[PDB]
């Protein structure tokens, strides 16, 4: 279990502990997964997505059952294998981001560019620039959100945790169905109860019993489960 961000990352003056990253509460390093929606023209190939997220094109390609060079249709959510490890009491996966245009902000980088896989707070904590003093060409340390299964989750058969980017209309139930896991397991993973609200544009942990499906959209089909 990790605390749910609960939209604290939208207010960059908020200092709730969850915004600084998942807590190191299990093994020091593990295999994990991120998710990311292809964005054209900058982040729509295994190469460019892997560059942004600090993965490899081969791992992206294998996780999605595509080649390492074919373009990914815009808005397709892909899986991105990453190593998650503990740093400073937090689980994270480090990446680097060079600002492209002056006018980018810690919030636009966390919420737009990285699609909520990091937070403005964790960017601010781990970088030297004041929020109002960012320029094109500045390099940022990007602490991407991931976690490793706790002992209790491992004992229940979860091999990995996946950082799932939630879209409007989804719910814990519908997300759990994509991955073939019980809803309660998604609730437990995020310290939520069955009436808790989950927001779109806020990442959610999904515990996995096996590697994720290669195509998430069709994995959401009712005909791809319960038969």
Ligand X SMILES: *[C@@H]1O[C@H](CO)[C@@H](O[C@@H]2O[C@H](CO)[C@@H](O)[C@H](O)[C@H]2NC(C)=O)[C@H](O)[C@H]1NC(C)=O
Residues that bind a copy of itself (CB under 8 A): 41-43, 45, 47-48, 50-51, 57-58, 67-71, 98, 100
State in angstroms the smallest separation of the CB of 42 from a copy of itself: 4
Query: What is the per-residue binding string for ligand X in 64-83, x denoting contact by CB under 6 A?
Result: --------------------
Give me Rg for the CA atoms of the chain: 17
Is residue 171 close enough to count as binding ligand NAG by CB under 6 A?
no
Instruction: Choose between 10 and 80: whose C-beta lies nearer to a copy of itself.
Output: 80
One of 47, 56, 94, 183 touching ligand X (CB under 6 A): 94
Is residue 67 close enough to count as binding ligand NAG by CB under 6 A?
yes
Instruction: Choose between 58 and 210: whose C-beta lies nearer to ligand X.
Output: 58
Residue 69 binding target from ligand X, ligand NAG, a copy of itself, none, CB below 5 to 8 Å by type: a copy of itself
Measure the CA–CA gap between 184 and 50, rounded to whole angstroms. Answer: 32
Is residue 66 close enough to count as binding ligand NAG by CB under 6 A?
yes
One of 22, 26, 45, 111 touching ligand X (CB under 6 A): 111
Residue 118 half-sphere exposure toward CB, CA atoms < 13 A = 29
Binding-site size for ligand X (CB under 6 A) equals: 11
State in angstroms the smallest separation of the CB of 66 from ligand NAG: 6
Residue 87 binding target from ligand NAG, ligand X, a copy of itself, none, CB below 5 to 8 Å by type: ligand X
Is residue 126 close enough to count as binding ligand X by CB under 6 A?
yes
Calculate the CA 208 to chain-centre distance. 14
Q: Do 165 and 205 form a contact (C-beta atoms < 8 A)? A: no
Binding-site size for ligand NAG (CB under 6 A) equals: 3
Binding site for ligand NAG (CB under 6 A): 65-67
Binding site for ligand X (CB under 6 A): 10, 85, 87-88, 94, 111-112, 115, 126, 141, 201
């Amino acid at each position: 279990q990790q605390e749910y961000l609960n939209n604290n990352q939208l207010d960059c003056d908020n200092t709730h502990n969850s915004t600084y990253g998942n807590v190191c509460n299990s093994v020091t390093s593990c295999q994990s997964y991120l998710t990311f929606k292809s964005s054209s023209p900058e982040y729509n190939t295994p190469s460019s997505i892997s560059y942004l997220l600090n993965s490899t094109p081969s791992l992206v390609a294998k996780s999605n059952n595509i080649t390492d060079v074919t373009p990914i249709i815009t808005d397709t959510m892909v899986t991105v294998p990453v190593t998650c490890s503990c740093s400073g009491g937090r689980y994270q996966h480090n990446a680097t981001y060079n600002l492209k245009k002056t006018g980018e902000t810690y919030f636009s980088i966390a919420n737009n560019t990285y699609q909520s896989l990091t937070t403005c707070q964790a960017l601010m904590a781990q970088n030297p620039y004041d929020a109002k003093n960012l320029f094109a060409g500045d390099d940022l340390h990007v602490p991407l959100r991931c976690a490793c299964p706790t002992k209790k989750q491992s004992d229940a058969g979860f091999k990995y945790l996946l950082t799932y980017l939630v879209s409007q209309g989804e719910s814990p139930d519908s997300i759990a169905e994509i991955f073939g896991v019980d809803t309660q397991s998604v609730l437990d993973a995020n310290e939520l109860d069955s009436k808790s609200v989950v927001f779109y544009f806020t990442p959610l942990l999904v515990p996995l019993k096996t590697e994720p499906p290669a195509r998430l959209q069709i994995a959401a089909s009712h005909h791809h489960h319960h038969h």
